[PDB]
């Protein structure tokens, strides 16, 4: 597949939903490394997100931009990154070769839970994407 | 001051050294938001770092690059970021208005310690830089 659709798509959304419930994050996305959104889910209590195409293309651009740093420091790429503001934070984890799990969260979501469930979710989504894409 | 020199410089290096000891990080740097290195220290057990001007300019470029994301998500800027590879990770924390504390570390440095002491160090270095620069 070049697009995630059908049962893989259905399962990916189900994983993103459970990830929101387990973390308390606002928004959860699986995106490819070109910034295309493969699946997304938003907590019913959260404000409408920013345009998710923009968000995904900036996350994917930054993820590519950071490889220079990982290589400067002697590794191939980073696998995970957390960016924290006063209120809002952004978690991104590799979901296999060609996808990234993105979680947007506020202070009400314990960063430890965001990381712990986020990692499990990226593995599940990697498995789905490996078989599908 | 436009450069950190004299007693402020001396104290900043002393803070970076204690930060390496408290964290177990490889390399510690205070850099300005233009990527200029104000102070740096390296653990005696670690390999020679990558060119620290390059490292600082890439860290500063990325920090600027990420503001678009923070603003997309409704805040002014991120205050802190962690990037983790299989072995190496990179911690960056705001040190006041015009500087960033950077810690480069491997698996032997507990991320919790890196964050906890890193935050204290960025506050101390902010204080030094506020009075000096």
Automatic annotation (TrEMBL), chains A, B:
- Is this entry keyworded Metal-binding? yes
Q: Where does Mg(2+) bind?
A: 80, 93
Q: In Gene Ontology terms, what is one molecular function of this protein?
A: identical protein binding
Which segments constitute the Roadblock/LAMTOR2 domain?
12-105
Tell me the superkingdom of the source.
Bacteria
Residues forming coiled coils: none
Q: Which GO terms describe its biological process?
A: positive regulation of TOR signaling
Keywords in alphabetical order: Metal-binding
Spell out the protein name for this chain.
Probable gliding protein (MglB)
User: From which source organism is this entry?
Assistant: Thermus thermophilus (strain ATCC 27634 / DSM 579 / HB8)
């Amino acid at each position: 597949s070049l697009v995630l659709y059908g049962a893989p798509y259905e399962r990916a959304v189900e994983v993103l939903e459970e990830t929101l419930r387990e973390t308390g994050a606002r928004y959860a996305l699986l995106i490819d490394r070109k910034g295309f959104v493969l699946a997304h889910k938003e907590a019913l209590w959260a404000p409408k997100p920013p345009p998710l195409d923009t968000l995904a293309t900036l996350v994917a651009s930054n993820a590519a931009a950071t490889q220079a740093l990982a290589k400067l420091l002697g590794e191939a790429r980073f696998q995970e990154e957390v960016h924290q503001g006063e209120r809002m934070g952004l978690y991104v984890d590799e979901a296999g070769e060609h996808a990234l799990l993105v979680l947007v969260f506020d202070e009400t979501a314990p960063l430890g839970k965001v990381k712990l469930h986020g990692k499990r979710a990226a593995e599940a989504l990697a498995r789905i994407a490996e078989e599908a894409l």
